[PDB]
Every structure is written in structure tokens, then in C-alpha cells.
């Protein structure tokens, strides 16, 4: 799945 961590 799409994962967005910055």
C-alpha cells in the first residue's frame, strides 16, 4: 500500500 513518512 502507499506509505508517506518524511
Amino acid at each position, epitope marked *: *500500500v*502507499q*506509505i*508517506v*513518512y*518524511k
Partner: antibody
Amino acid sequence: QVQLQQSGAALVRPGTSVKVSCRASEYAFTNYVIEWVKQRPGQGLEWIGVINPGSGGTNYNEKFKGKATLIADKSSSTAYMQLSSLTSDDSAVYFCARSTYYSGALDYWGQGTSVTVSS
Amino acid sequence: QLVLTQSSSASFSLGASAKLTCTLSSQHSTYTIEWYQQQPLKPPKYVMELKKDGSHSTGDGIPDRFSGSSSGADRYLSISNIQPEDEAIYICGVGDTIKEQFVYVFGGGTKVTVLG
């Protein structure tokens, strides 16, 4: 009004470094991240990287790994992108933009900084 | 492999209905994308976030003429009653975190022309 204000137009010589500034105001600097976007004159947007001001963490497009260095100063609420070894390829409009830690939206964008590498 | 493919830079009559397509790479079918508007010599503007189910959340000062919708890997930006101010390059973006390494990628853009 959420605002990001970048340093002005820069005309520099090949082989040199440049430092564009991105000053945040009217929002919590360390509750969001700063991302940098290149745009050559007739071309589409190109993503360079992101700095997490609160962590100092950086993520970069692989293409700019030897070219762009991203840093942020919390006390000044200001983000900086250093471009090194300037070629005529590096001649573009550089944008800064706000994003969240956890979503993709670049929701607010700086005005931009025209960097010209010319002889 | 994370790839956004934008339909061909196209024209619409003033006050007509426009439907732009941003298509995700097969394996990234489920992904949330963002639409961006770039007007002549302006910085890009955030238009919306758009999810697999076609639900969307629009940016500051985006009129309700702009809606989003989805079908499989396809992400659509619909402009009803298109206006001169809607003349722009519409760019889609998508984020993902692969190896704890975050990457954002943009589509090539669709240049939108408003006729009449």
C-alpha cells in the same frame, strides 16, 4: 495567510555553489516539512527532496543526491537548499513548498528563485 | 515504476466541461494523487488530493467548479463551466515510501486551453 518567501534571482558562474532561502511565516514551522521543486524554463516540474525541520531528516530524488543539500533553521523558521558544481543544466526556477509529514500535497508554494548558471 | 501518465494537452470552450486523466502505474492502482494548477509564470497552486474511491479535498481558494473522481488506476480532474482563469498546465503528483525513502513524482502535465 500562509507564506513562504524565497531569496531573489541569482546569476552565478559555472563551477560555483548557490544558496536559496525559504522563510516560513503564519504557520507552525515544525508541524510541516519543506520540499524543493526544480523547473527548467520550458519543462515540467521535477522533485528534488524534502527536509523535516523538526527532525532534520532529508529525503531526495536520486538524481540530485550529489547536487542539492537541504538544511532548515528552526530558530529562524528558514529552509535552505545548496546547489553545488553548477552546470548550465542547473539553470532553472527553484520552488520551496509546504507539505505534511504523512500526505503528498504540496499545499503552499514559495514565489520561486530563478537560478542562472551563465558565462 | 511509480509513473503518472497525463492525457494530451487539450482545449475546451469557455463554460464547457473538461475531464483530465492522470493514470497510475498498474501496481499503484490504489494510490492517492494530488492535482496542481500552474498558470502563466505563476508558482504551481495545490488544487486537490484525490483517493482511489474518488473522494477529494480541495486547496485554499479553489472554486467548487473543480471536482475529482477515480476508476481503477485512472485519476480524473473535472472542471465544470470552465473559465479563462482555468487556462493552465494541470500537473498530478504522487508520493510513496519505498525503503523508508520517500519520493514524490509529477506527471508531465496537460496544457489546458480555454477557447472563445
